[PDB]
Structure formats: structure tokens, C-alpha cells
């Protein structure tokens, strides 16, 4: 109805600079807004403690799930698209400021934003809004989605990861597979273990985790693959692909004794393709023989 | 109507109770009879003080024991005051009536006499071994009488004519057919030594060896009744040798007394060497004994002194302690706690004052440092005082052992901690890699090279306000400068990749790989977390027979691997890891270095044969001894 | 002369005790030392809740993860967390729970634990892993929402 | 003439003796009063057996305890037979006069009654804590009287006209100022639990909290019944009540003895070992002794050996002679006989449990340490205890076997049992000592506890076959003539190399010889027949309270054994024959000796020398 008259009575005092274009967004419970921040002390010393548009790092913020600090939400409520304004706030709104910017810039021992910890005061906030989209249009990021919708979202993530992998890109496929795996695992906490639903959820993560291990092995990160493969084999102990990947990693990191055993387990569990396992064994033997010859040359009489 | 009555007794049942249920050992009958004789001699001697005519019937006060296997009788003759007919009837014939108590009560207050006997039932312990008892008495104011009975509800008194007893009493026991063990020399000697050792009059024994041989059996005297100032060290040595049968004399002695509501006198000796079976727990310890009026009551039983002070030999004598009916126990057992407190305090004072004489404290420490350290591990009240009696080798000291006080007085200004290392031997610790930097910087390190030192330092947290810091634990801090801090930070930043790789290779053997701050010439070392067993403590605890192997996981510490940035091997490893992180040689070198550090840091390998095989492989090398579905399998699902 | 091998020992005491728990970690039966450590009697332990009432709020996620691992493999490794006493105090404990099977199915849980001091507990907490591998990435979850319904293990029964 | 008097007694001093020097604990007055009440209840129950009309003043037989902090009194009410005026004057007013003894003697032979109390002095323990004692009594065929005294040498009896009581006695103690702790709930409960737990009649405490009444002795003494009429469920309930354990028992032995010495015993085995089994600071109260269901003393190491400390149970007797305080036995030599019987029956129980497999596995996992301690300590039962031992073996895989199974599986050419002691199973299994012994097909027992090292000192042979360590010099094996010819040829071939090695390692070993137990490793260190092994040395070095100043004289001497068929040894022989003074052979011999030392269970005096050797080799390998 009338929010401008509401802000003043709430304690804050704000002044508009350039009116934005378009109508006022609904800003219901759950909404994504993109905008820039540039915060500077009001009168104590006048300097700038944190800035985004000064260097060009947008500060994304979805409106109203919990967002401990309620000042930012109320501030962006009365701003439309392309509206630039500056203003200050009372100490009460921003008393707990250090619990916001401690990492929002580092994740991407502060001496500026820690100044408030020893002497609070009102602080100026220079805002600039660019875009504001209600839920439904923008691709919701995985952490903000609801369980019932993330359940149906996982397959699209799986397919996007596969499509990226086949094209010839890995790091991005790894990121997509990681997001899908985390999304599935968070759901399992919603369900009791051992029950049919927990095992049902577990059934659809092993393929994704196998793809993740495949990509990790391709990017030459072997030690990581071993942990995930061991986690899979401990519960199942009947995965041919899991044993194959674990043995390949063991061979890659010179763990011949275990690589051979895992390859033998694959052979006894999947006798179909002997040529591939034998080829891997031969390659491992050739590499080991080469290194043995080099070491024999290296020592060659150190005593006398 | 309200009637009024007086209590009564059943004499037959009372006698049965006295004979059967009062005394557990049948040997204390001799103690009771000797106590009675001593009381009689005290009475006659005191009476003769103000009337020397009372000794006209003999001037010597003594006690004699005369076995007679032919008649199967035992005689105990004394030349004491003796009993009149009326006294005989009133004292021997009445249960719970004591002539000694009445004599003491009628005595003028403020006189020197301390007589055993206050209950009036001791004489009837003689029927523990005797089927019939005959008493022949003779007083200075009466004729000689004979008192006879079998504890069968009545006794007879008659005038006795025969060999005249000049003055005193004679008790003849007709031993039972199964109690003839008390007619032999060994048994009587042992009983008298155990119970009546310090009676104030000679106790002669007469035996057939023919002729009548004699032995005093109580030659030694209770020197603890004399003033401590009057006694010379030679007399103390003689008493100690007589008490402990030691061919050499004591090392130190303490002679104190306590006055007040509870009073006693004590004599504490420190032996010159540790007995060969000091700590064995199947010994029934009797190091300190308790006496009441020079009569043995009970052994220590770890009630009069803590277990870690069990090497002290001594005596505790009191005048007024409430005893049980069988005088081998105390009523109000809580008095033993007060006695123990006093004894412990005085023992600590003795140790503290003996520390000034360095030469003798050297011997005492070499003998009983184990006991001192065990006391530190056990005693919480006296921990601070005990900590000041410890002596250790240090890096700065030579072949001598120094105290912690000297260490504190010799510290640097910046130093805030006491540095120590525990190991298996002095040679092992002195040459370890944990102490290179500490010793190079000029700090002092305390060497503790015995298993008991682990238990000792578990409870010793700080001395004189300064904490104790182990050089084998993670988190060692030394005083530093700004340039050193900058160098450490730069080194740490330069070696992050190598640390990550080394942690990856040692997947589960270590908990962390860091940059060392205590190494000089070694490449690496292994230290343990702040909380949990050190390598030495873990080694000692895993070798204990009576240890619960299920609890090991709760008490062990995590291993941290630390590497030296200023060593050629480490620099070579860093360069190789930068060149190619999956190199085989790097992996083999990392594993070999970890195993060598594990062996040198005090740990034991899970399988030593793996290390042996690696070494053998190196030796042999030195000597020169010797389809289309494929693409489908590993693409997607 | 020289002595033969004997079994002289120092006989160190410890404060490790065992407890019996139901599948939902409801204490049903405790060792004598446990009563001293956690002020309670026989009846209160049963009629006080379901175990998760005892866990300190900060430690709830750690304990839930350990419970998941215990069910998956039958026993959780050593874990250090806080427990709720009758006097409302908190005491750190190092516990290791084990799952017992009667007939191919879980029957109850036996826990072996050791009381800790505040210093050792704080030390263990500091080093505690801040996150688990497949977390939700730095999506500012603890900033924007910071509200999760917690694992279904904790939901009563 | 010969006179003849009768023994007299002086009453005042006698009362002082009874009140001041008989009992060392003031809490036993409750025990004495409850014993008196139980005897009275037994008397009335027995009397009503033939004349049911006797129980016309009441049918319930119970005991009551009623604190009264306001008046500072304690009251013990019972519904027993009571006593008349004549009894009040005689029984209660005469010291050393027992009415219970007279009642028992009046009975005919084989009576179904066993009453506590035969001395006639226990009632006066009430004055340990009380200033004045009032006794209200009421017999069937008599009025109701009041007896009063203050231990002042006289007592009064008057006909009471207060609130009537149908039958029985009511003792009122006016507590002293300093003895008011006995009016509290906790103290009374503790005392009753300690002393009169198993009295045969209900004991109830009345408290203000409306006067709530609580029964104190809920558990019955099941040991009086017959063993075969008791189910395991009630056995377990009794065990849980006794030991306070939230778990059930594992096994139970219930037996009896007859003759001059008669007693009954219940012995239980816990399912789990307590975490404070060997904790020194503990009282030996695992087994309690009772006489006529009244507690006498705890085990105190005289009733059972120290290696059976995990046994919980009860020993009850009817005719043990006690002392006046009833806190110990006269002629304490009976405890030896009782201990002998208990040990025999415990061993019998273990043997019976051995028949079951899973239960015995649980029991062994819990108390094998105690069994081995018993073997080390007890010599009479060593043979019986040796058949309860179970060990891992080279041929048993994951389970554990007994020595008899080992002997039944022996080969005709095998005269001895072979074993090895070490730090862990992995270490011993992959040891260099067991290579050939396992290759030939023989069987080796694995021992991986320090208590095992203690144990083997006493277990010299089993079933007539001796035990042989594979870590000691002169290991004997069956052989063929060709093997001996080859051994002699090898010795002749390697004499010179052995001589040179013994020269190089002066005063580090006492011999260098040719091994007969190595297959794949080049060398190993063994100890002489006399002295400690490496494992025993490791265990002895770690004893904190042991005097190790003279340990050098008990340490064994170490012999180095060489493998004739190893490439390294052959190359060493060739190098030595070529040039014996070379540095290569010296360094190689030193390195081999150190590695064998490390792998054989010993520890180097200075590990840093070995570490520096390895570091030098690494540096040379890296080219630095
Ligand atoms: N040898 C003796 N000479 C003189 N009087 C004796 C002798 N033996 C016993 N009596 C007297 O007989 C009494 C027996 O008492 P006893 O049972 O010994 O208890 P207590 O020693 O406390 O008196 C003593 O009071 C003592 O006066
Ligand atoms: N509560 C009671 N009811 C009936 N008779 C009692 C009671 N208490 C004591 N008496 C009688 O008074 C006597 C006192 O003896 P006591 O001190 O109990 O020794 P004891 O128990 O060995 O007889 C007993 O013999 C008993 O017959
Ligand atoms: O170890 C405990 N001891 C206790 C004593 C009383 C109540 C709970 C617990 C313990 C729990 N260990 C746990 C492990 C995982 C999840 C939950 C839990 C617990 O509640
Ligand atoms: O001589 Mo006594 O009867 O023990 O006081
Ligand atoms: O009730 Mo008694 O007088 O201890 O046998
Ligand atoms: Mg006497
Ligand atoms: Mg009685």
C-alpha cells in the first residue's frame, strides 16, 4: 500500500536519487533480486568498508526465506528495476553486521567490517538494482529449491552433465554431477535408513557417483576416486564398474598388489571381457618393469 | 505398680563366652600372663619407693618361664606384689573385676606408672590351652595360698605348704593333650618376641640342654621412651639393627611425639638400601607396628602409612587408645587416619631435611626414587612437596642429577616452560631428533629415562608456576624473532603441495603433515597429539600383562608427521613433486622415510618384515643381484 | 639373588563405562559409573526421552552422521560430543556405539564411552571436520535459509 | 581345710565392657534388633504349626521401622511371639542368658527351624546409639508390659496401658544427640541392605513424604531351594538384583557340601568383564559369606584365589563358629577348606561350559587373561587349566583351537608343539622364524599377549609333549639323511664367511652359524637356550616397579643365523673370498645385522645410527 511512509516510522531514513523503470515487483515469500552494493561509513570516518560495483562483483540476494539480517530485505523492498538510492540505517538494524560480510567476499580477519564490533554506529548503504525476477522464470539454484521439486530436477542435471561430458568438457560435467549427487544425498536425510525409500534413493545415486568417479579419473585425480569407489564397494560388493575403476586408480598410483586383486575380482564377477582386463594388466606390468630397470640403473653399486 | 530390678549374669555362659568367642589366636594367653606379671612388678616397685622395707623378701624384679614336657605343664613365676586371700577371691574369682584399675584409681594423681589391664577378663584366656590352672601366691601381709580351678563354675582356695615363694605369684598351666606345641623352645621364643618384646623387666626362660640353661629373650629396650636429645646415633643404630636384623645401620631417623586429645610417640627409620622384595604384594606388610603401653597391637596394613612409604621401618607407641576386648584392634578406627596424617607429614619433613646433606641424599635417592615417583603418581595432597625431592639428568648437567629448582633458577628470561623428553635410555634421548633445535638455541632439556617417569609426569603439570612441556608432542613453542617468523611463514607457504601429497600417500597412517620447528639435521620426525599417550607411554602400556586391550583405542594419540624444510632430501622431494606428482620414486621415498621416522621416534611397526623387505630390495639392487564394448564400459552408465 | 619374572603392575584406574540403548538411542540400563558421570537414576533414563534429547544442539549433526554410519556398518568409530545431565550441565564424552543382531536384524545398541574434560573436549571440537564431502556447495545456505529439517533419524520413532 | 567358692561377676563393669569394647561399629544395633525380631517371628511361626489358634492376635508376620525426627526416636515393631513378665525379667534382664538357645534345645531332633542368636548379649548393642531403651511387649497368654532402662545398673517393669498391640514386641530407642544420622532414609536403607538383606520376613520403613510405607528386602534367598527346581529366569533375576548389572548372567553353579563342614554356594559368571577387574583400589567383595542368611564378611582374598576375582556369588553356612562381634570367624582355618571346594567347583563349571561353543567363546574372550594368570600362579590346577586355553594357529585360519586339537592333528614325526610369541598376530604370522616350519607343513601356535609370555614359563609340556619356541637357538626338526648331508656341506662352505662376520660384529653376537629355519629372508637373530627371549625382554624392560639394575645378567645372548640359499649371502661369500678387507662387505654386514635385529623383536640401542645409514643410502640413490 504505502511502504515509503512505513520505512521512516520503522527508524530508517532514506532518499531516492534516480527513479527506476517499470512497476513495483511483488516481492513475495521467495524471490530472486540482483543488485549492487557499496557500503561506506556515514559520519565516523566517511570511508568505504566494502564495495561491489567499484570493481564489478554482483551481490545476488533472494528475498525472504530466512536471511538472518532483515535490513537488506526491507531495503530492497522499496526499490524497483533500475532504481538507484543511498541511505543509512540505525545501529539496531545492523548490530550483527559482522555475521554477514565475514565471508560473502572472502568466499569467492577483516579489519574494516570488524570496526563495528568495537564501536557500532549508523552506516550508509548505496544500492543499485538491475533485475528482479519472481520464482518460475530464472533457473532456481539447487540449494534454494524445495525437496519435492529437486526430486524431479535431478534427472535434468544428470542429462546435462552427460551431454557436457560427451562433448569434450569435464570440469563442468564434474560440477553438474557433484550438484546432482549432493541434491540426492540431502534428500536421503529426509528418510529413515534401511527403509525401502532410503535404498530406492541410494539406487539412483550410484550411477551418478560412478560418472563422477569416471570424470575424476579422467582429470588424473586418482586418490579421490579411491575413497568413493571404496564407499560404493563396501555397501554393494557386486559392482563391476566400481571394481574396475578402483583397480584402474590403484594401477595409476602404483598400487599393483591391490590393482591386480581388483582386476581378478572383476574377472571372476564379469568373465565376459577378459581382453580388456588382460590389456590393463599388461600395461601395468610394462610400466612396473620400466621403473624397475630405471631403479636398477640408479643404484648400480652404491656400497663399493 | 512400677517394680525395679538389678541386672544379673549367667556365670556358666559368661565363662563359655570368654573362653570361646573373645580371642581368635590361642597364643595370646602368654601375652596376657606376661602383662599380668608386669603389672604386679610395677605395683611392688612403686610401693617400695616410699617404703624400702617392702623388698625384704627379695630385691630383684623379674619374670621366668619354665616348660616341663615330663608333667606337660608351663610355669610363669614372677616376684611381684602378690595376692592376699581376700584379693585372690575378689580378683581372680570375679569376672570383669580388675585390681589394677582400682590400684590406679586410688593412686595419687601425678605419678609415673602406666599399667596394662583395665577389663578384668584377661586371666581367663589361659583356659584356651590349659585344662587346669594352679596359682600360688604370697603377699607381704599374708601367708601363701593356692588357687585352683578348671573354669567349671567353681574354684578352691587352700593354704599351701611347700617350696616357699619369697614374694609374688606362680601360675602353673596343665596344657591340653593337643596344646603341647607350647612346651618347645622355638614356639615360646617366637610368641614372646612377637607380643612381649618390650616388657620393662627381664623375661628369662629355663630349658633342659645336662643343666638348666637361661635366656633373657628381651635384651633390647624401648629407646623411644627417652628424650630424643639424650640419644646418640650409635644407640639408634643398635635399636634399628635389633628391630630389623640388618647387618648395617639406618640412614636416617626421626623421633617425634604428638600431644593433645590424641597423644603418641613415633620412631621412623630409613633403611640404607631397598629390600629385594619391596613392592611384592603378597607380603602382608608389617613395616610399622603399633604399641599401647609397650605391648604390640597390630601391624601397619597400609592403615598407618601410605603404600608408597612402605620402605620405612618404625614404631608407634601410645598411652591411651581405646582397645577392643581382644587387644589386637582399635575401637574408633578413624583415629588411624589422624595418625597416618601426622606420620606422613613428619616423613616429608625428614626427607626435606635430609636433602641438605647432599652426599647421603644421593644414596637415599638412588634407593627410593621409585617410591617418591609412585607417591607423586598417587598422592594429591603432598604432590607439591614431593615434586621438590626429584632429581634428573639434564642436557646441560654432566654426570650429576639436578633438581627442578636449579633448572628454574637457571632458565632464560624469555623461557616460560620446562622442557623434558621421555625415552628408553639416556643415550637414546640425548641423540634424538626432537632436541636438536632446543639444544642448539641453548635451552635445557630434562632427561627422564625410566618407565615410572611416565606415570610421574602424567600428574606433574607445572612446577613453581611453570608448565612442563614435552618435546615429542605436537605444538611445541619456542621464543622467536620477527625474521624467524617470516622465514617460517615463507617455508610453510612454499611446501604446501608437498605436504598435501605426503598426506595423500600416507592415507591413514598419519593425521597431519606439517613443517617442523624443532629439527636441524634430520629430515623428519613423528610427534603425538596433545591429548593421548606418547610413543614411550604407548610402548609401556602395551607391554603390561594386566591391561584391558579393549580400551587402547580410547587412550592412544594421533601421529603428526613433521618435515625439515632445510634438508637436501626434502628439497629434492619438493622439486620432484613439482615436476610430476605421480612419480613412483616419490611414493617409495615417502613410504621409506615414514617407516624410518616411525622406527626412530619410539613407535613399533605393524609389520617389521615390510621394512626389512624394502631394505633387502635396495641391497640387492645395489649389488646388481637381479574390443568395441571397451568404449562402452567406461563412458556412461 | 636375581628375581624371576613376576607380575608387579601399577594398576591404573579408568572411568570407562558401558550403557544399553534401544534402536533410537533410548538409555535402558546403565553401568554404575555412568550414574555418577550423568546424574540420573534407573527410572529417569528410560522416562526422559529418546537419547537425541541429551545431545547438545551444536553436536546434533555430528551424532546423526555417526548414527547413519553405525547403521550402515554396525558400529560408529570414536566420536566426541556433549551430553545433557540432570542438572542441565554438559560433559564431553568419547563414545563408540555398536549394533547387536539377534536374528539378521538389529536388537539394541551397546555404547562404551569415557568422560572427558572441557579442555580435551574443546580441543577435539576445534579439529572436528567443518563439512562433509557432498555438501550443498557454498550456496549461502546458512545465510539465506539456514533452516534444514534435520535427518529423519532424529524424528521420534 | 580346703574352701570352695563359686565364680561371681561384677555387673556394672560387665555392662561397660559389653557397651564399649565389644563392637567396633555402631551400625550393627539395627542388625541385632532385626535378628531378634526374625527369631521371634520364627518362634511364633513354628508354634502355630501344631496349634493354628496361636495366630489369633494376627496372621501377618512382618517387621517395621519407624523414624521420628521430632521426638528423636527409632522404633522397631515386629509381630512375633512376644515375651511375658518372667521372660522380660530373665531373658532381657540377664547378661549372657539366651532364650533362643533354650527354645532350640527344647525342640526335638530334626526340627525345621534355624534361629540366629546364642550368646545373650546382642540386645545391649542398642545402647551404642541410644540413651534409653523402652521395650513394649505382649505375649499370647499374658498382659502387656513395658520394660525400661538406661544401662545404669537397674531396669523397671510396669504394666502398660497404652495403645494395644495384638502380639509381639515394640522396641523404642531414644537416640543420642550425636547419633541422629540413623533417623534418615538413606542411612537406614543402606544399613538394612548391607546387613539384613536376606531376612525371611518383610521389612518395611515408615516415612513422612501421609505416611508412605516401603518394603526393603524384596529379593528372596533362592540358594535355599533345590538346584533343579529353579529356572534360569529367576536365577537371572536374582543375579541382577545381587550384582546390580543391567545384563543377565552367562553361567551359574549351585552346589552344596555335607559333613562336619556344611555350606551352600551360588556362583555366577558375568557376561562381560568389568572395566575395573584388576583395579587395585577395590575391596574383595565379589563373594559374600553368610551364616543363617545374615552377612558376616566379604571375600578378602581368603575365600577364593586372586585369579578368580571375576566370580560373583554367595556362600551360606549354618554352623560356622563366630566371634562375639559376629563380624569374623573363630578358627579362621575353615576358610582354606571352603576355598578349596570353591576352586574345584569353579573349574568344574568351566569344564562344563567348554562343551558349548558360542558361550565358551564369549567366556574366553572375556576372561582368558584370568585363566592364564591362574596358570601362572596356581600349580595344583595347572593341568586342568591348560585344557581351557585356546590359541590362534597357522592352520586354524580365523577361529581359535585348543591344545588337544593341535595334538590330535600332529604328524607321527612330530615330537613337540611349536609356538611363537610376539607383539601382534600379524607380526608373528609373517615372521622369518616360521617360514620353513610352515613350509614343511607343521603347525605353529600364535601367542600375542604379555600374559602369554608369563604363561609359557610354567607350561613346559602338555599331554606329555613339550613346547618349543621357534625363536630360540637349536630348533630341532625331523629330517632326511640327504638334508643332513646338505647341511654339513653348507657349513663347510660357509665356515670362512661366518668367521669373518663374527670378527666384524665383535661383542654384538656370540655366534654366527647356518640357519635351518629360514627360506626367503637372509638372516635372523635367535637367543640362547638360557635367558629371556626378545619378547620377554621387551615385557621386562617395561615394568615400572621392577629393579632392572642387574637385568644384564638375566638377558639372553643373541646368535646370528645366515641363510645359505639366499642370493645376498652367496654374493657376500664371494666378496669376502675375493677381498676380505673391502668396505662393501663391512657396511653390508652391519646393515644386515641391524635389519635382522629390528625384524627379530629387539630394539637398537641407538636408532639414529640406523636412520643415518638409511638416509645416506637414500641420498646416494637420489644422486645428491
Ligand atoms: N601375677 C600377679 N600378681 C598380682 N596380681 C595378679 C597377678 N595376676 C593377676 N593378678 C590380679 O588378678 C586380676 C586379674 O585380672 P585380669 O583378668 O588380668 O585383667 P586385668 O589385667 O585388667 O586386671 C588383676 O586385676 C590382678 O590384680
Ligand atoms: N523382639 C523380640 N521378641 C521376643 N523376644 C525377644 C526379642 N528381642 C529379644 N528377645 C529375647 O531376649 C533375649 C535377649 O538376648 P539377645 O541379646 O537377643 O541374645 P540372643 O539373640 O543370642 O538370645 C533373647 O534370648 C530373646 O529370647
Ligand atoms: O554415546 C551416547 N551415550 C549416551 C547416553 C545417553 C543418551 C545418549 C547417548 C549417546 C549417543 N550416541 C549417539 C550416536 C549417534 C546418535 C545419537 C547418539 C546418542 O544419543
Ligand atoms: O588384662 Mo585384661 O583382662 O586384657 O584388661
Ligand atoms: O543375638 Mo547375640 O547375643 O549377638 O547371639
Ligand atoms: Mg591382665
Ligand atoms: Mg540377638
Author numbering:
A (entry chain C): 2 to 109, 134 to 329
B (entry chain B): 11 to 219, 275 to 691, 714 to 724
C (entry chain D): 271 to 427
D (entry chain A): 11 to 219, 276 to 690
The authors write:
AHR belongs to the basic helix-loop-helix (bHLH) PER-ARNT-SIM (PAS) protein family. Upon ligand binding, AHR undergoes conformational changes leading to exposure of the nuclear localization signal (NLS) and therefore triggering a translocation of the complex into the nucleus where AHR is released and interacts with the AHR nuclear translocator (ARNT).
The structure reveals in its core a nucleotide-bound Hsp90 dimer (molecules denoted Hsp90A and Hsp90B, respectively) adopting a closed conformation. Therefore, we concluded that the nucleotide binding site contains one ADP molecule generated from ATP hydrolysis, one magnesium ion, and one molybdate ion that is also involved in the chelation of the magnesium ion. The AHR ligand-binding pocket (LBP) takes a form of an elongated channel extending perpendicularly between helices Cα and Fα. The second indole ring is primarily involved in two hydrogen bonds with S365 and Q383 via its carbonyl and amine moieties, respectively, in addition to several van der Waals contacts with H291, P297, G321, F324, F351, L353 and V381.
